[PDB]
């Protein structure tokens, strides 16, 4: 873990630029778990709370 992380961190000094991988996007955005679970269930619950239960 030490050696691999150190090697990957040392490659950040090179004058090279590359667009991120999809695995990196999955890791950085927390498996997309808060992007989906904090939007879809909350939206559906609040929408049913107004449209069906109340009105």
């Amino acid at each position: 873990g030490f050696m691999l992380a150190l090697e990957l961190n040392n490659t950040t000094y090179y004058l090279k630029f590359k667009y991120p991988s999809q695995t990196y996007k999955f890791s950085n955005m927390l498996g997309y778990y808060p992007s989906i679970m904090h939007r879809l269930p909350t939206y559906h619950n609040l929408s049913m709370s107004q449209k069906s239960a109340s009105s």
Binding site: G1, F2, L4, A5, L6, N9
Partner: protein, 110 residues
């Protein structure tokens, strides 16, 4: 884990307070010499977190890994535990390398 995790948080807090409430490691440069006691404490805490022998985390973590290795256990769970053990050292390395090594990346008013 209580000991060194609380110590790691206070080290992070000292860094944040020194750098005018900045929390992004991309704007923390070379603090190894500028914050020597904080650097020492966070190095020791990261070594304890990664299970360096004869430190606080060793006597706990070392045994847990051995017990998972030597038990009638789910094979996927054991593999995932070992990979997570590697990733622990990975993100400890990330913190140390980005926050304390290299050149300053914070605003010029030190």
């Amino acid at each position: 884990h209580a000991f060194f995790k609380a110590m790691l948080f206070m080290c992070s807090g000292s860094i944040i307070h020194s750098l005018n409430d900045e929390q992004d490691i991309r704007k923390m440069g070379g603090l190894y010499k500028a914050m020597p006691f904080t650097t020492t404490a966070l190095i020791i805490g990261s070594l304890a977190l990664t299970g360096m022998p004869y430190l606080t985390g060793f006597y706990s973590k070392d045994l847990i890994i051995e017990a998972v290795n030597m038990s009638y256990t789910n094979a996927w769970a054991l593999l995932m535990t070992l990979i997570a053990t590697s990733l622990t050292a990975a993100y400890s390395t990330r913190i140390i390398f980005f926050a304390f090594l290299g050149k300053p990346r914070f605003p010029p008013l030190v």
